Design a protein around this ligand. Structure first.
Ligand SMILES: [Ca+2]
Ligand SMILES: [Ca+2]
Ligand SMILES: [Ca+2]
Ligand SMILES: [Ca+2]
Ligand SMILES: [Ca+2]
Ligand SMILES: [Ca+2]
Ligand SMILES: [Ca+2]
Ligand SMILES: [Ca+2]
Ligand SMILES: [Ca+2]
Ligand SMILES: [Ca+2]
Ligand SMILES: [Ca+2]
Ligand SMILES: [Ca+2]
Ligand SMILES: [Ca+2]
Ligand SMILES: [Ca+2]
Ligand SMILES: [Ca+2]
Ligand SMILES: [Ca+2]
Ligand SMILES: [Ca+2]
Ligand SMILES: [Ca+2]
Lengths: 87, 87, 88, 87, 87, 87
């Protein structure tokens, strides 16, 4: 299915960024910064702002381990999905 | 981007199903059952069974208006995304 | 303030039904049914139907104690709020 | 009914502050501070400190669009309700 | 520490039921029925009723794969604590 | 039963810290500080850093009353469990 394909897509993009550094299944502040700035540049306003990136990071990182795992990632998909529907 | 592409895809699928009947911007049970069985067939177990479909509908429709609106639909992406990353 | 008065309003309405029976601070299915059918009759579709009332009770009672307490009630005020704004 | 009046009341108050500037349908940081400091003065601790208003704004604005829309505002009502029943 | 001790306790108890049948690391409807009725009988009302066990299983199995995984099980702890501090 | 004993355990630790200052039934920052660093040292990363204790305090304190009450505490239990299982 296309819907399935879009889902595997999102999953693929997650890993695309999570493997660069440290844990392969988790995103570091730095990797999330990349993901955010390159992949949602037209979705989240001011995503370019150091403060905006930090605020998003601190909020996904529910368990304070300094990493964003896949389950925490889902939150971001939901926010983004909200924006994309608004346009 | 790609990520933005996928998210736009998801939005577009919603609407692919929501305009068939009643309100254009929301899914009725019928509409939701179509979307589930053909677009998540390989994602949610037993998704074809009547009981599962009803259970999922009853859960999304948080405000009991017998419609699944976009906000409510986000939750399903969440459930699905979970599953898709699992495979 | 006006906003403070409406919030005090909702708390008072909650007690208005929670004292009828059993614990004074919680709603039983009965007390909830009365509240729903007499105070949200124009907010939630088919609120009069048995099925709907139970589905609602079954969802608010997160701890499964057969009582809806105030924190659990706040959920209902959220659904209700969505509803009112949409009508508006 | 009364419960319904109170709800419509809260929606009204929302609109009373959202129409002063920018989109009519949403609350700016500024609009939000106004409502907080004169509508909730006797509900949230130290709600008259810049720090506390920032924090509430930052939390209610989940999509980071620098605006607080009605669905996001509902969370504010939840926090408030909590406080009001405590008295 | 003691808190750590209790948390480890909970995980342990999860496992003592999850390994009985099927996947070792997730709970089947049967496995859960066993955990609820034996470990939570003085905590959740009417936990010995067929109907309640199922409503609790249906609720926990957020992804409809007919198993309760540790993440899903965490919500049971939340429901239970609420009750425990009540006594 | 053991699970029940662990739950009660969790409630007792909470109170062990909550009775120290101000209201016996809620944790002040200071009280929360102690609890975190003495009961979760081997569970949450850098729990020792003043920045992290503050961030955790700010997240639990949903109503902004500068106390963490039992309900709000349950979120902390969930973050911790998640970690303890991961270990
Ligand atoms: Ca990484
Ligand atoms: Ca952090
Ligand atoms: Ca994390
Ligand atoms: Ca439709
Ligand atoms: Ca329903
Ligand atoms: Ca709905
Ligand atoms: Ca009562
Ligand atoms: Ca129930
Ligand atoms: Ca209850
Ligand atoms: Ca405005
Ligand atoms: Ca922000
Ligand atoms: Ca916003
Ligand atoms: Ca098993
Ligand atoms: Ca199910
Ligand atoms: Ca499951
Ligand atoms: Ca205290
Ligand atoms: Ca704060
Ligand atoms: Ca608090």
């Amino acid at each position: 299915t296309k819907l399935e394909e879009h889902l595997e897509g999102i999953v693929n993009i997650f890993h695309q960024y999570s493997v660069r550094k440290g844990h392969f299944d988790t995103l570091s502040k730095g990797e999330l910064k990349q993901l955010l700035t390159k992949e949602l540049a037209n979705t989240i306003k001011n995503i370019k702002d150091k403060a905006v990136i930090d605020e998003i990071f601190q909020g996904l990182d529910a368990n304070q381990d300094e990493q964003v795992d896949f389950q925490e990632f889902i939150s971001l998909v939901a926010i983004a999905l909200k924006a994309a529907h608004y346009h």
